[PDB]
Curated annotation (Swiss-Prot), chains A, B:
It catalyses: Endonucleolytic cleavage of DNA to give specific double-stranded fragments with terminal 5'-phosphates. GO terms for molecular function: DNA binding; metal ion binding; type II site-specific deoxyribonuclease activity. This is Type II restriction enzyme PvuII. Keywords: DNA-binding, Endonuclease, Hydrolase, Magnesium, Metal-binding, Nuclease, Restriction system. Mg(2+) 2 binds at D56. InterPro entries: PvuII_sf, Restrct_endonuc-II-like, Restrct_endonuc_II_PvuII. Its cofactor is Mg(2+). Its EC number is 3.1.21.4. The gene is pvuIIR. Mg(2+) 1 binds at D56, E66. It comes from the Bacteria. Homodimer. The lineage of its organism: Bacteria, Pseudomonadati, Pseudomonadota, Gammaproteobacteria, Enterobacterales.
């Protein structure tokens, strides 16, 4: 049982990583990309916010952030919000966003966009709601290209 | 100028303390009791949440807390919420509360009440709203005695 052997021996680290993840509010590294999210948290120094919170993270000085991420091996657009409306927008434009770019599970880069750097999309998204008559927008996307063009890279592999 | 001398020489520390306070999201130790609040933050390991947030703090694992405090040299009841209503209550009973007890500016003790430990007051407060017909409650208080009787002391001077 070749591959299997790497299992009872590689498992000490996986567990340690999970221990690390728990100290950071992540109960299961193997669900909802928790293992990738820990990467971002340890690199940036952020603390995750309860899922019920509008934003997803905050630093040691009380500044909050939206946290988006993608695996470029399968997509090129960042998810934003399901049932996206102008109130959601309104809460969004108040905080900086940090974008995590992975290749599979590997963190390749992290970008930070200031509130103004997203002004373009917030405006666009509003039109598609009101000119649209009225009606949510189901998760419009933010192009990795745009993020790279306007953000400041705070991390690279 | 006797006392004045203690000023150009005691000022190196006060400033350092303020430097410490800034690293913790507190812009001015001399306003809104920021100097006392830093005490609590450093003792407990908490991070403050933006004032717009319902709760006031969160730990490294994403658990949030309400943060109340008093100087027993002048009062014996903990403030809760102005324009207190049942929705406010509803958000409140979901998180633990940590109470800071000071003598003047000195931190004397800190207590933590679990959500259930406040069940008594939440229920009482509801009656005074509905039996009251309907109408907010302007900041009812929580007795230090009660806090000491039901909380677990996480710190003492």
């Amino acid at each position: 049982h070749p591959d299997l052997n790497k299992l009872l021996e590689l498992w000490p680290h996986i567990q340690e990583y999970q221990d690390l993840a728990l100290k950071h509010g992540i109960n299961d590294i193997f669900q909802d990309n928790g293992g990738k999210l820990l990467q971002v948290l340890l690199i940036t120094g952020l603390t995750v916010l309860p899922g019920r919170e509008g934003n997803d993270a905050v630093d040691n000085a009380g500044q909050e952030y939206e946290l988006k991420s993608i695996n470029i091996d399968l997509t090129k657009g960042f998810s934003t919000h399901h049932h996206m409306n102008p109130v959601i927008i309104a809460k969004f434009r108040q905080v900086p966003w940090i974008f995590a770019i992975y290749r599979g599970i590997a963190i390749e880069a992290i970008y930070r966009l200031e509130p103004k750097d997203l002004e373009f999309y917030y405006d666009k998204w509003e039109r598609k709601w009101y000119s649209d008559g009225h009606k949510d927008i189901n998760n419009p996307k933010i192009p990795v290209k745009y993020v790279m063009e306007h953000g400041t890279k705070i991390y690279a592999a």
